[PDB]
Design a protein around this ligand. Structure first.
Ligand code: NA
Ligand code: NA
Lengths: 160, 160
């Protein structure tokens, strides 16, 4: 157990730019609203702002259509923990893993952290495979709520 | 603004071992209980456990005597955010700054984050100077609550 989550001051350009959701994971007992599931929103880009907030560019599975959604996750009083009001969730964080080569984007609802927690594995290309899915599972085990990764699906509408 | 707080999986040995509090900082409007001020507790060591918690070994200014205090800050459902019930505070986090060469230890009380937030600058030796105090101020500015560093004091009872 040679690795643990800490907060670190990170070079903005390790976070900024284009990203692709290559895998998703949910808490063992997951109770998501359905009308706006975090599982239907695919990250396309990130951008830390000059004020310390985080912009997230998403594409969501919206009815059988694909819409663009821009979230401004706001700084809170604990560093690296952001406030949103979207996708059934109200808390968001980035988890930089496997020596800064694997970014996780995770969302939670403080009313029921154990039922609402979803994480997405982000990458600079849409390329997946077992090993990357295995690297995602390794990072998820350092999390408090037990988590399960969703089955790989090669094509997903609205996922760039 | 090329640097922002993210959560990262960090090598446990960057955190474990002996540390010394070389500077302290408080929120501009600080309202601390007085009977157990976070300003009278000096960190001596840290140890991430196999379960994901964090042990903190402190020495506190206890009446005009010096006592040893061991805190077991517990994992919560947001990574890198720990739960305590001590020193007037209930939330604790580590902030690794200035390219992992400067550890900050910060505590807060969720009832009033803006009044209770205190950070300590930790180092491998007790050596301070302006530049290190300046590096501490740089990291504190990425925090949401505005903060002020306390005047340097060369000798402080109970501070190893
Ligand atoms: Na601006
Ligand atoms: Na053990």
């Amino acid at each position: 157990v040679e690795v643990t989550p800490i907060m670190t001051e990170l070079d903005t350009q390790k976070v900024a730019g284009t990203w692709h959701t290559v895998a998703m994971a949910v808490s063992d007992v997951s109770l998501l609203d359905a009308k706006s599931s975090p599982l239907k929103a695919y990250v396309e880009g990130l951008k830390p702002t000059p004020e310390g907030d985080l912009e997230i560019l998403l594409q969501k599975r919206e009815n059988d259509k694909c819409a663009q959604e821009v979230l401004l996750a706001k700084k809170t009083d604990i560093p690296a923990v952001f406030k949103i009001n979207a996708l059934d969730e109200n808390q968001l964080f980035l988890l930089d893993t496997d020596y800064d080569s694997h970014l996780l984007l995770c969302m939670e609802n403080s009313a029921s952290p154990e039922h609402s927690l979803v994480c997405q594995s982000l990458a600079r290309t849409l390329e997946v495979d077992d090993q990357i899915r295995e690297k995602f599972e390794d990072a998820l085990k350092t999390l408090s709520v037990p988590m399960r990764i969703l089955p790989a699906q090669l094509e997903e509408q609205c996922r760039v």
